[PDB]
Design a protein around this ligand. Sequence first.
Ligand SMILES: COC(=O)[C@@]1(O)C[C@H]2O[C@]1(C)n1c3ccccc3c3c4c(c5c6ccccc6n2c5c31)C(=O)NC4
Ligand SMILES: [Cl-]
Ligand code: NA
Ligand code: NA
Length: 315
Amino acid sequence: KDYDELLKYYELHETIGTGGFAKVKLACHILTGEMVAIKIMDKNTLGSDLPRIKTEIEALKNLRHQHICQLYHVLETANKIFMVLEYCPGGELFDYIISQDRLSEEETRVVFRQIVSAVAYVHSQGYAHRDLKPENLLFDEYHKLKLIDFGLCASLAYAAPELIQGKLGSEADVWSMGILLYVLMCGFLPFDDDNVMALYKKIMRGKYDVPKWLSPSSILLLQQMLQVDPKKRISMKNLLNHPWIMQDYNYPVEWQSKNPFIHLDDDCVTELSVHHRNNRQTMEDLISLWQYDHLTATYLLLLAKKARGKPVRLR
Ligand SMILES: COC(=O)[C@@]1(O)C[C@H]2O[C@]1(C)n1c3ccccc3c3c4c(c5c6ccccc6n2c5c31)C(=O)NC4
Ligand SMILES: [Cl-]
Ligand code: NA
Ligand code: NA
């Protein structure tokens, strides 16, 4: 019944993950043949969370970035909310780290500059992510990273001491990025314990193992990101051009969106109007409402073809 609405536009394939208050399924958008990821949430189960879902959705509508997984379509039915997202066939950074054991400093840098890019942009737009971890970072077709899961934007192992103590959202995301940096280069958490309060204690103390394979510059950067006092912690600003970050690149992290929505793409508009046998101007006007309905999804998925060098064409 709920699925009747979705199945007008998508063929549903297998579940690819489950995360707290949602399951995500692989799917194909019937009109463009593009694969997508559909986040499915039941409104009734966890009904008081629905406000944080609703603001996650509006946040995503204001994020458009080369390292942020794109929202295409929101469908609300009687009992469900369905969010159609850019599909990242490379899967989770988490599983990539498992298979490699740990990344070299060179490859960590490549990956980490993408993460800093996404997060600095999120902050530039006035948000904090607040659940940065390797399950929330995916590899797309080109092995580029895409940040997902804005359900807590405004677990324990990645949470900053000040956030734990209920006391600074920018600074807290930097701490989390430090935990991520550590995990990339080391392949295990800097603070970990079976007992949650003992984990808390270790976080508050700020002491962690420094493995033998870490370079002095890496060790310094970790020290600066993992300051328990947020006032002493490196700020986002200084992370973007940190010497460790700058090694082999020689320019600071490029955080600004490279793909911003300026004017409508003539060719996507033209293809829709021709395909729907509709007046080109009505089509422009209707696309310009930006409802995140099936027309928006189709438009955006055509834009995505264009940016992957595929012909802008409907079937
Ligand atoms: C259990 O794993 C997770 O927590 C994930 O964040 C990771 C996992 O499912 C979750 C719930 N997930 C999410 C949780 C919340 C929002 C989006 C996702 C999500 C997305 C994708 C994938 C994905 C692709 C391939 C393998 C696993 C994948 N997952 C997702 C997405 C995707 O390609 N696009 C969005
Ligand atoms: Cl960069
Ligand atoms: Na260890
Ligand atoms: Na930039």
